[PDB]
RNA sequence: UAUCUGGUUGAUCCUGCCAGUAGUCAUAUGCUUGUCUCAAAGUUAAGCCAUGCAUGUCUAAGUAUAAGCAAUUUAUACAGU
């Protein structure tokens, strides 16, 4: 089911005549909880107008993952594949596959991410600047998915020819 | 398996130093001051030290205080080898 959580907002001040005005980047993650989740960013005058762009944007970019069964463990069950690790300026993602039980522990940017996608277990690391807005959760989405980042490894097989 | 924030600007992103968040100490100081168990308690002048105490024990190593000889002390059923 289609979850909307939001995530921040900065207040984003621009000088013009007699004073400021302000306009908000407000920051929305969609998520299926069956092993999709989506991304969107874009601005607006108000909240209240930033909010819906954040969220209509975000279920264009949607991206795939592998977690869970189709029938067997074509994903891994409630963790992420393999680890990855995504650079995206001065930023850095890290991941890695929990046991059972564990939780989702994560900086608070990228576990709205990983829960939303259904990945339950999981240690979650970053490194460096940690810029909320863009660039850690740029580098969590072309960490964590199956188009971009992880691969499981049965697809790995399928795509040569046996 | 490692999550950073604030301060150089009109605003932004880097570089970079500083300040703060945490855990710890034979502890010290301000303040308040109600208990307990366990543990610890001169880091400075290896400076100068009063007084009392920290090193003794055996008679089971011997003559063996009879036979013979001064004085004093202790023990007993009687000898007190």
């Given at each position: 089911?289609?979850?909307?959580?939001?995530?921040?907002?900065?207040?984003?001040?621009?000088?013009?005549?007699?004073?400021?005005?302000?306009?908000?980047?407000?920051?929305?993650?969609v998520?299926?909880?069956?092993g999709?989740?989506?991304?969107?960013i874009?601005?607006?005058?108000?909240?209240?107008?930033?909010?819906?762009?954040?969220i209509?944007?975000?279920?264009?970019s949607?991206?795939?993952?592998?977690?869970?069964?189709?029938?067997?463990?074509?994903?891994?069950?409630?963790?992420?594949a393999?680890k990855?690790?995504?650079?995206?300026?001065?930023?850095?993602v890290?991941?890695?596959?929990?046991?059972?039980?564990?939780?989702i522990?994560?900086?608070?940017?990228?576990?709205?991410?990983?829960?939303?996608?259904?990945?339950?277990?999981?240690?979650?690391?970053?490194?460096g600047?940690?810029?909320?807005?863009?660039?850690?959760?740029?580098?969590?989405?072309?960490?964590?998915?199956?188009?971009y980042?992880?691969?499981?490894?049965?697809?790995?097989?399928?795509?040569?020819?046996?």
């Open positions: 089911g289609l979850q909307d959580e939001v995530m921040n907002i900065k207040p984003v001040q621009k000088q013009t005549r007699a004073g400021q005005r302000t306009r908000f980047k407000a920051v929305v993650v998520g299926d909880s069956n999709h989740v989506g991304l969107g874009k601005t607006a005058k108000e909240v209240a107008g930033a909010i819906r762009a954040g209509i944007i975000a279920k264009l949607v991206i795939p993952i592998r977690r869970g069964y189709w029938g067997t463990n074509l994903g891994q069950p409630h963790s992420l393999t990855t690790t995504g650079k995206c300026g001065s930023v850095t890290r991941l890695i596959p929990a046991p059972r039980g564990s939780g522990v994560a900086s608070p940017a990228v576990k709205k991410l990983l829960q939303l996608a259904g990945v339950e277990d999981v240690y979650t690391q970053s490194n600047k940690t810029r909320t807005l863009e660039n850690t959760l740029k580098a969590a989405f072309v960490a964590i998915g199956n188009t980042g992880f691969l499981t490894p049965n697809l790995w097989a399928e795509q040569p020819l046996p």
